[PDB]
Nucleic acid binder design. Structure first.
Ligand SMILES: [Mg+2]
Ligand SMILES: [Mg+2]
Ligand SMILES: [Mg+2]
Ligand SMILES: [Mg+2]
Ligand SMILES: [Mg+2]
Ligand SMILES: [Mg+2]
Lengths: 113, 348, 64, 274, 113, 93
RNA sequence: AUAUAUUUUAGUAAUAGAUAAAAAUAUGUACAGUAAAAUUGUAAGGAAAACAAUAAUAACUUUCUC
RNA sequence: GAAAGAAUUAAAUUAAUAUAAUGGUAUAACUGUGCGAUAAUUGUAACACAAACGAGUGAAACAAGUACGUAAGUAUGGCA
């Protein structure tokens, strides 16, 4: 006899973060083999086509008319925003830094070049 | 022979250099080109054979065509059509081609390239479309100065800026340049070169330099800042350099505040926009407009809202972008602005 | 053994060195990489000696 | 590489950015090849083309007159058929391929003053099959082609592999040359006058030859090439000589129109037409 | 090193090649360049005009044919039918030759068949 | 086994610097079978050629309009139609 | 026309185009383009070597012209 | 009315992807070409995915240096 008793395990390749879900920077929204979902707004894409969040926000799945026949995952900076954002409106940006109210810290920062 | 006549036609259509003109129009290939300044090089040079007679024939052909066009041009009443006819007549003139190609378009001398003349203006427009306009568009799109400030641009006027008063050096700013705080310490100089047919006497303009990237920590985002605001400026095709000479203190809706980027706040886009005024009929002379100076604010400035209010149309744009350096504190001190904030290096 | 290991020693004489793999008869492998002792990009060269598959030096000067 | 995800970003303006012009890399390349300042400059309209002039004067009007069919409407070709929506599986389904063919066929227009048939291009494909043994034979064939045309040939390489015929893949084997405009016209004139009459039992081009749409072809043996005046003048210099295929491409809607056009330029046609 | 056949092949190759056979680049003065441009542009315009003239003439001929055929259809149906036949295998006569540079010894043949 | 010319390193034609192959060509006069001359540009150095067998003397191109030679030469006194009629009895075949 | 001297040419070798599905540098970046099959043909060529051809132009810009 | 350009629409990922099979890829990840041969570099790597541990995977950001690109930027080996 000779049996075909050999197989790899399942690659855990679902969506790891869902519509309306809060995200943090670095977090993986999708694991996939090839771009089933394309990286949308405020979202990066890795070597393994893994969509990850570039900013803190709300994960949103959407279609964009500019790219028909392509699904997108992006991260809205608030829950208020429809994440296929209006084209000619200005981009919702995050400053994401804090001023150094502390005097010593500010001085150190000024010194550093 | 319409192109030899200068009774009704401007002086600019001729070549001002006499030697060059003589070289162009001779009966044999005897003379040597004025372009080649050096004797040895002239000796070395040999122009292609038979070029003269054929050239003369071509001139005659195109001169005839121009004359025919002129027959139509004078009968025409409406202005844009007339201008187009004039362009058609003179665009193939060798002399005007020589003038345009081989002399400066930016700081045009009126006798050589007159932008009051329609043909020369058309040529200048074409030149702008070929390179400078495309570049400007690229810099607006890539840096994200269009959607962030003002939705779109349909580039009509070529806008070039300069910073003569601060340092001393002469340099037209390439769009999307990084300028030092020393360079942009004092105000800039605009040159709004208009290529469309427009009423020079009536048409006024406004110029707004806006900084979309100043950080607002309440919103955790950015806000706009009107760094320099002029209104009701008069341009002329040749007389178009917007300098403290031209505009009065009444024209300044918001007088120049310099780029003073904060440490680690990032790179700050400064995108000048040039709008033309709405032109009112049944009113001789330039129609002014009053700006509510308490209503518009400098620390936060809705450009789009402002445009909507005064019914402006953005014809031109230019952009530089400043970031923090050692001298920004000195600039602030000179202007009497406060010490200036310092942010964390990490965008956490 | 088809692919052998080699030691690339930094040309700026720090002592820093990086190791890479090559085919047995591959050309001499020099590469410019960051030397952290010197804090710059420097040339690396093979410290040891080894035999090479001798390619005919292609002649740009048109011979004969 | 952090990723392979290709995704062109949309823009916020309608100006067409020519990216080539914004660089300062290839200043000679910014000029058109027609422009004198380009190193690629070549005098195009050097002398009056004779065959072309003849076509313009005599033939074109005659051809138009021939091809007039009264109130002739357009004949649509075989195209990809859409599905009837009589099932919800038709909803994003690709269209059925054409009726007879796998590839779509073009519409045949009525001939009017605009779309009169005329010569478009000649291509002279010479694939020498002995060059599977000897690469130098390909070179000689290319030279011959150049001599014949006065135009630069392009080398043909073996695209396929096969054992029965001793043929490798990626081996230089003969050459080709697409003639266009005045050189092509000259070549046709030479064919009509010098070469094809010196072929002994030459009936003509077959009427069964051709594409379905405005393309006619034939071939010359190695015996026939020695009648070309460039080859004939030095028979010592040309010991070997290679046959060739000659693809004539017309601006004809159909093949009978193309045949008629070629006849106008003194090409004989012998076989029973389709 | 090389055979006589190899040598002859090399010579043949050289005939086709641009190696050390081509002159210097055609440089012009600015005035000369302008003159050239004006020559070329004018020529191009002339060619366009000629094309339009010929094209116009062809259009006029087509219109005349259309006018004729309608009239024929109106008057005599049989004549119209005869006119409007498929001329699929129509061949230009072999006497209508492509006009040479200079004429032959016998300009015209008065007898035939 | 395969006869070849082995390639040297190729010369780098830079982008923009590529020049079109304008081969050396002479204006050559072809006189056809009849006296009709035609000018054609040609690469071989010969200003004038006169052709013997052309379309202008081929029957296919105008329908409306040396062993044999040796034989004629050495059977000339006999003068070899009448001769055909004499030597053509079609009974035997 | 011919002699000597001093040079110059002839080492004859392919890409001429940002080349684009013959073969060849498999990682970077910048710019650009589209394959395949099947069908109709064509010198040896044949089911199977190579080359050609095979969906639609409404609107827009420029040019010439009635 | 004609010529040229810009192109758009339809179709296609059946070819091609160093290599199995699957998913992805013409907006090309496929192919050609210039430069290059550098990022098949150096210290800190949060946060995620996966996950008994040992390991494995994607990776923002900070700092040093390099290559290409007018620029925007891209590159810490290869469509996965
Ligand atoms: Mg599994
Ligand atoms: Mg697949
Ligand atoms: Mg878990
Ligand atoms: Mg662990
Ligand atoms: Mg790969
Ligand atoms: Mg790759």
């Amino acid at each position: 006899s000779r049996t075909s008793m050999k197989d790899s395990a399942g690659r855990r390749l679902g969506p790891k973060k869902y519509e309306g879900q809060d995200v943090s920077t670095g977090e993986i929204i999708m694991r996939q083999r090839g771009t089933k979902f394309y990286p949308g707004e405020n979202v990066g894409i890795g070597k393994d086509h893994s969509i990850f969040a570039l900013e803190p926000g709300v994960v949103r799945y959407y279609l964009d008319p500019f790219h028909p026949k392509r699904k997108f995952i992006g991260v809205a900076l608030r829950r208020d925003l429809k994440l296929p954002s209006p084209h000619f409106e200005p981009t919702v940006r995050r400053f994401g830094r804090f001023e150094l109210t502390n005097k010593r810290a500010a001085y150190k920062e000024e010194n550093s070049i | 022979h319409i192109w030899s006549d200068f009774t009704t036609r401007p002086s600019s259509l001729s070549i001002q250099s006499s030697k060059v003109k003589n070289y162009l129009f001779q009966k044999k290939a005897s003379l040597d080109p004025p372009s080649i300044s050096r004797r040895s090089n002239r000796i070395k040079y040999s122009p292609p054979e038979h070029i003269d007679e054929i050239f003369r024939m071509s001139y005659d052909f195109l001169e005839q065509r121009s004359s025919k066009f002129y027959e139509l041009a004078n009968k025409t009443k409406n202005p844009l059509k007339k201008d187009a006819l004039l362009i058609k007549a003179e665009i193939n003139n060798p002399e005007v081609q020589y003038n345009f190609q081989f002399n400066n378009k930016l700081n045009n001398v009126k006798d050589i390239i007159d932008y009051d003349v329609p043909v020369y203006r058309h040529l200048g427009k074409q030149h702008w479309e070929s390179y400078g306009q495309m570049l400007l568009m690229q810099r607006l799109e890539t840096l994200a100065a269009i959607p962030d400030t003002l939705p779109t641009l349909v580039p009509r006027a070529e806008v070039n800026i300069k910073f003569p008063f601060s340092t001393g050096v002469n340099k037209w700013i390439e769009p999307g340049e990084f300028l030092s705080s020393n360079v942009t310490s004092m105000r800039p100089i605009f040159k709004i070169q208009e290529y469309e047919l427009v009423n020079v006497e009536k048409q006024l303009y406004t110029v707004l330099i806006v900084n979309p990237d100043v950080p607002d920590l309440s919103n955790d985002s950015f806000k706009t800042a009107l760094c320099y605001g002029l209104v009701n400026i008069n341009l002329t095709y040749n007389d178009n350099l917007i300098d403290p000479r031209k505009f009065h203190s009444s024209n300044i809706i918001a007088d120049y505040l310099p780029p003073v980027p904060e440490k680690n706040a990032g790179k700050q886009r400064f995108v000048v926009w040039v709008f033309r005024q709405p032109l009112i009929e049944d009113k001789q002379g330039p129609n002014m407009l009053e700006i509510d100076r308490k209503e518009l604010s400098r620390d936060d400035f809705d450009i789009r809202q402002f445009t909507k209010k005064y019914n402006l149309t953005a014809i031109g744009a230019h952009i530089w972008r400043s970031e923090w350096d050692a001298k920004v504190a000195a600039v602030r001190e000179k202007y009497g602005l406060p010490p200036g904030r310092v942010f964390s290096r990490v965008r956490r | 053994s088809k692919n052998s290991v080699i030691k690339l020693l930094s040309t700026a004489a720090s002592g820093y060195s990086r190791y890479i793999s090559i085919k047995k008869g591959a050309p001499l492998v020099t590469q410019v990489r960051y030397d952290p002792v010197v804090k710059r990009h420097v040339l690396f060269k093979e410290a040891k000696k080894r035999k090479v598959a001798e390619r005919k030096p292609l002649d740009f000067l048109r011979t004969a | 590489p952090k990723s392979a995800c290709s995704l062109v970003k949309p823009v916020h303006h309608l100006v067409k950015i020519d990216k080539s012009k914004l660089s300062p890399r290839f200043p000679e390349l910014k000029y058109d090849k027609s422009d004198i300042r380009s190193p690629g400059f070549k005098p195009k309209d050097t002398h009056a083309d004779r065959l072309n002039d003849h076509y313009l004067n005599t033939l074109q009007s005659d051809l138009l007159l021939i091809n007039y069919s009264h109130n002739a409407a357009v004949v649509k070709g075989l195209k990809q058929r859409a599905w009837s929506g009589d099932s919800p599986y038709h909803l994003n389904r690709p269209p059925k391929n054409p009726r007879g063919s796998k590839a779509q066929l073009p519409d045949i227009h009525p001939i009017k003053w605009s779309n009169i048939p005329g010569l478009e291009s000649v291509v002279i494909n010479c694939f020498v099959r002995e060059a599977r043994e000897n690469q130098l034979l390909a070179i000689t064939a290319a030279l011959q082609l150049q001599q014949i045309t006065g135009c630069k040939p392009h080398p043909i390489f073996s695209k396929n592999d096969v054992p029965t015929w001793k043929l490798r893949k990626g081996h230089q084997m003969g050459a080709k040359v697409e003639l266009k405009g005045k050189e092509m016209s000259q070549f046709l004139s030479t064919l009509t006058e010098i070469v094809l009459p010196r072929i002994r039992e030459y009936k003509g081009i077959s009427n069964q030859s051709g594409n379905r749409f405005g393309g006619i072809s034939f071939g010359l043996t190695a015996e026939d090439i020695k009648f070309f005046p460039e080859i004939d003048a030095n028979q010592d210099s040309w010991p070997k000589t290679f046959g060739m295929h000659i693809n004539i491409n017309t601006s004809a809607q159909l093949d009978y129109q193309a045949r008629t056009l070629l006849s106008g330029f003194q090409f004989p046609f012998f076989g029973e037409e389709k | 090193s090389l055979s006589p056949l190899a040598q002859r092949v090399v010579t043949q190759l050289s005939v086709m090649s641009a190696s050390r056979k081509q002159p210097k680049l055609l440089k012009l003065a600015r005035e000369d360049l302008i003159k050239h441009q004006t020559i070329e542009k004018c020529w191009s315009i002339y060619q366009q005009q000629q094309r339009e003239r010929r094209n116009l003439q062809l259009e006029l001929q087509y219109k005349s044919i259309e006018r004729s055929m309608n009239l024929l259809q109106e008057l005599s149906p049989r004549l119209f039918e005869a006119a409007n036949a498929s001329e699929k295998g129509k061949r230009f006569p072999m006497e209508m030759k492509v006009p040479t540079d200079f004429p032959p010894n016998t300009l015209w043949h008065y007898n035939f068949r | 086994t395969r006869i070849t010319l082995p390639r040297r390193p190729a010369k780098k034609i830079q982008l923009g610097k590529s020049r079109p192959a304008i081969y050396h060509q002479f204006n050559v006069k072809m006189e056809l079978s009849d006296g009709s001359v035609v000018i054609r540009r040609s690469q071989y150095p010969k200003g004038e050629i006169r052709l013997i067998q052309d379309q202008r003397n081929n029957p296919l191109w105008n329908p409306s309009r040396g062993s044999l030679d040796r034989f004629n030469k050495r059977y000339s006194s006999l003068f070899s139609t009448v001769e055909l009629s004499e030597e053509n009895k079609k009974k035997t075949q």
